[PDB]
Design a protein that fits this description.
The complex is a heterodimer of chains A (238) and B (367). Chain A has 238 residues and is an all-alpha fold. Chain A contains 14 helices and no strands. Chain A is elongated and about 65 Å long. By secondary structure, chain B is mostly helical. In chain B, helix 5 runs parallel beside helix 8. The chains are: A mainly alpha (238), B mainly alpha (367). Chain B: It is found in: Nucleus; Chromosome.
C-alpha cells in the first residue's frame, strides 16, 4: 500500500476563486460581511474541491483506502480560517452537525494532515468550540474496527482526547481491551493490531513500564510483526 | 542544574538509541508521552542538537535517505516534519513556566537543556556527539553555523527565498529555514531574558547580531528581496545554500500546496517583522547613557533607516502585510515607532496612498 489514506478532497481547489476570496480579508481581519461568493458551507467546501456534492466514510465503498490523484490544496490555515466563518454559534443543530462533520472529515485526510503548520492554533481553536464528549460522541465516522489507524491520526493531531476516546470505543474497561486484543491476533489483522497498540498504550488502562500480557503473545506469534515487538520493548522500558 | 537517577536512564537510553541511527524510536519515545500524566520526558541537549539537524533534511530534496531510514513509516510522516513538531511543542512548553504543569524541576531541567544547546551556536553518560558528526548526510547545526561567516549566510539566505517564485528556493525557506529561524530567534529572545535578571553585552548582542558593520546595512539586510528603492548597488553577494542540494528539487517528490503570492508575502513579512522585533529587544535596554560597544548600534537612527526602506517602497500589497499584523499586542513598542517613522518621511519628502495605512495603525493602537 502507498498513500492509501482517507482523501476527503477529491478534486483540485478552485485557485483563482479562492485567491479572490483570499483578498478583502487581511484588512478585514485587522479592522462574514463578504459572503456573496459562496452562500453556504456546502459552497465553501466544493470551492476547496472538497467533494462532488457530498459526510461519512463509506467503508463498504472502500472510501477509507483511496489513491493519490495528485490534487492540489490551498494552505490549511486559510482553509480553516475560511471554514470558521460559517460557524453560526447561535443556530440550529442540523447545520452545526454538518459544520462539525465537515471539519472532522477535512482534518483526517492525508492532504490536510501532511500539509499542516508546525504550530497548531486553528486546529485546537476549532475543536475547543464543540464539546469533547460531543466531538467524540458524534465521532469521526469510521467503523470501530478501523477506528485505530485513523484514531492514531486523530491523537497525533489532538493528543489530549485519548482517555476520553477509548471509553466511547470500549464500554473495568480493561477486560474489553484485552478481549479486543484477541480477534485481532486470532485473525491476521496485525496492522490494525499495531495501531490499536499505538492508540491504547500510555492511557490509564495500559500504562508504560515493565509492569498487559501482550509481549508473551507476540513472542508466540513469531515483517510487520517485528515492529510490534520493538514498540512493545520500547514501551516496557519506560 | 543536575539530573536525577530517573532522568539519567532516559538520557542514556535516548543516546544509545541515537547511536544505532534509530531516530524513529528516538522520536516515538518523546511523542508517546506528551499528552499524558505530568512527567515531561525532557530531551537532553545532545538530542536537541540531533533534532535541530534532523529538521534540516526535508523530504523535498532528500526522499531516498528518509525512505531508507524507516521503510514502514507507521506515522505517515517524515523525520523532519516530526522533529519540527517536537521542537515547537517543547518550545511552547518552555515559554510557559507554570507550576500547575508537569513539574517545577523538569521544567528547569528543560530550560537548562535548551540553553546548553544555543550556547554552542554532564559527566555521567557517553553522549552520541563524541563519535558522530553527521546525521544522515547533514553535518550538524552547531558545526555548520560555527564556520567563518556562516551564521549570517543562514539568515541572508532565507530572507531572499521567502518571496521566491521558484519551486526549490521558496520550498527550502518554507520547509526548513523559515520554521527553524523562528525557533532560534524564539530561544535567543528568552536566553537574553535569562541574562539581564541574572547578571549583577548579552547573548542577543554577541554571536547573533554581531555576525554587522553599520546601522544602514542592517536595514538593507532585513528586507533582502522587497521592491524598495534599492539605493545601494553593492547588495548582498549571491547567497549559497547551507546544505548541498538544498536548492534542488528531487524528481520523485511532487508538491501539493498552491501558495498565492499574498501568502508568501505574509509569511515573509511576518519573519522580517519578527527579526526587527528581536533587534529592538535589546536596543531599547540601553539607558540614556552611552551606547553599547560590541554591536556599534545607535538605537535612535536605526529606526530612520528601516522607516526609510518602508516609505521608499514600490508595492502596496507588501506595505500592508508589514503593518497588518496578526498579533497587535505581541509586537508592540516598535510598530507604532515604525508608523510615526514612515509617516514622518513621506510628508517631508512629498509634502502616496501609503500615509493612510500609517494613520490607520496609529489610530488602531488607541486602546
Amino acid at each position: 500500500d502507498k498513500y492509501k489514506d482517507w482523501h476527503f478532497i477529491s478534486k483540485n481547489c478552485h485557485y483563482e476563486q479562492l485567491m479572490d476570496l483570499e483578498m478583502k480579508d487581511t484588512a478585514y481581519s485587522f479592522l462574514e460581511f463578504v459572503h456573496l461568493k459562496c452562500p453556504s458551507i456546502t459552497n465553501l467546501l466544493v470551492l476547496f474541491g472538497v467533494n462532488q456534492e457530498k459526510l461519512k466514510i463509506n467503508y463498504e465503498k472502500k472510501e477509507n483506502s483511496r489513491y493519490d490523484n495528485l490534487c492540489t490544496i490551498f494552505p490549511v490555515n486559510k482553509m480553516l480560517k475560511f471554514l470558521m466563518y460559517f460557524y453560526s454559534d447561535d443556530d440550529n443543530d442540523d447545520v452545526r452537525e454538518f459544520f462539525l462533520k465537515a471539519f472532522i472529515c477535512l482534518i483526517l485526510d492525508r492532504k490536510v494532515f501532511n500539509a499542516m503548520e508546525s504550530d497548531h492554533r486553528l486546529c485546537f481553536k476549532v475543536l475547543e468550540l464543540f464539546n469533547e464528549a460531543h466531538f467524540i460522541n458524534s465521532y469521526f465516522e469510521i467503523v470501530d474496527k478501523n477506528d485505530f489507524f485513523l484514531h492514531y491520526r486523530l491523537l497525533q493531531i489532538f493528543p489530549h482526547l485519548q482517555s476520553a476516546l477509548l471509553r466511547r470505543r470500549f464500554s473495568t474497561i480493561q477486560q474489553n481491551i484485552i478481549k479486543e486484543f484477541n480477534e485481532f491476533f486470532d485473525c491476521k489483522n496485525y496492522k490494525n493490531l499495531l495501531y490499536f497498540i499505538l492508540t491504547m498504550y500510555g492511557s490509564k488502562f495500559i500504562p508504560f513500564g515493565p509492569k498487559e500480557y501482550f509481549k508473551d503473545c507476540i513472542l508466540d506469534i513469531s515483517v510487520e510483526i517485528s515492529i510490534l515487538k520493538g514498540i512493545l520493548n520500547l514501551f516496557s522500558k519506560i | 542544574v543536575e539530573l536525577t537517577e530517573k532522568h539519567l536512564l532516559a538520557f542514556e537510553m535516548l543516546n544509545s538509541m541515537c547511536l544505532l541511527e534509530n531516530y524513529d524510536h528516538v522520536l516515538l519515545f518523546l511523542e508517546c508521552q506528551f499528552g499524558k500524566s505530568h512527567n515531561l520526558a525532557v530531551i537532553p541537549f545532545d538530542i536537541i542538537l540531533v533534532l535541530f539537524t534532523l529538521s534540516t533534511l526535508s523530504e523535498y530534496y532528500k526522499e531516498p535517505i528518509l525512505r531508507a531510514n524507516d521503510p514502514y513509516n507507521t506515522s505517515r510522516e517524515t523525520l523532519s516534519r516530526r522533529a519540527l513538531k517536537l521542537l515547537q511543542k517543547y518550545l511552547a512548553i518552555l515559554k510557559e513556566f507554570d507550576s500547575e504543569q508537569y513539574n517545577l524541576y523538569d521544567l528547569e531541567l528543560l530550560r537548562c537543556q535548551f540553553f546548553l544547546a544555543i550556547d554552542t551556536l554532564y559527566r555521567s553518560y557517553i553522549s552520541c556527539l563524541e563519535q558522530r558528526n553527521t546525521i544522515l548526510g547533514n553535518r550538524l547545526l552547531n558545526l555548520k553555523l560555527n564556520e567563518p561567516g556562516e551564521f549570517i549566510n543562514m539568515i541572508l539566505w532565507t530572507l531572499s527565498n521567502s518571496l521566491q517564485e521558484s519551486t526549490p528556493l521558496f520550498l527550502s525557506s518554507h520547509e526548513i529555514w523559515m520554521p527553524l529561524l523562528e525557533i532560534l530567534i524564539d530561544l535567543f529572545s528568552c536566553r537574553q531574558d535569562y541574562f539581564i535578571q541574572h547578571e549583577v553585552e548579552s547573548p542577543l548582542a554577541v554571536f547573533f547580531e554581531s555576525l554587522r558593520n553599520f546601522a544602514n546595512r542592517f536595514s538593507e539586510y532585513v528586507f533582502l528581496n522587497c521592491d524598495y528603492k534599492l539605493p545601494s548597488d553593492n547588495y548582498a553577494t549571491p547567497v549559497h545554500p547551507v546544505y548541498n542540494g538544498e536548492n534542488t528539487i528531487v524528481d520523485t517528490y511532487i508538491p501539493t500546496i498552491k501558495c498565492s503570492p499574498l501568502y508568501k508575502s505574509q509569511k515573509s513579512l511576518a519573519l522580517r517583522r519578527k527579526l526587527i522585533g528581536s533587534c529592538f529587544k535589546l536596543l531599547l535596554r540601553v539607558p540614556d547613557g552611552h551606547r553599547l560597544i560590541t554591536p556599534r548600534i545607535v538605537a535612535d537612527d536605526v529606526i530612520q533607516g528601516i522607516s526609510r526602506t518602508l516609505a521608499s517602497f514600490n508595492d502596496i500589497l507588501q506595505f500592508k502585510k508589514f503593518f497588518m499584523t496578526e498579533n497587535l499586542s505581541q509586537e508592540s513598542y516598535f510598530i507604532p515607532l515604525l508608523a510615526e517613522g514612515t509617516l514622518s518621511e513621506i510628508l517631508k519628502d512629498t509634502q502616496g496612498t501609503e500615509a493612510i495605512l500609517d494613520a490607520k495603525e496609529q489610530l488602531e493602537m488607541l486602546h
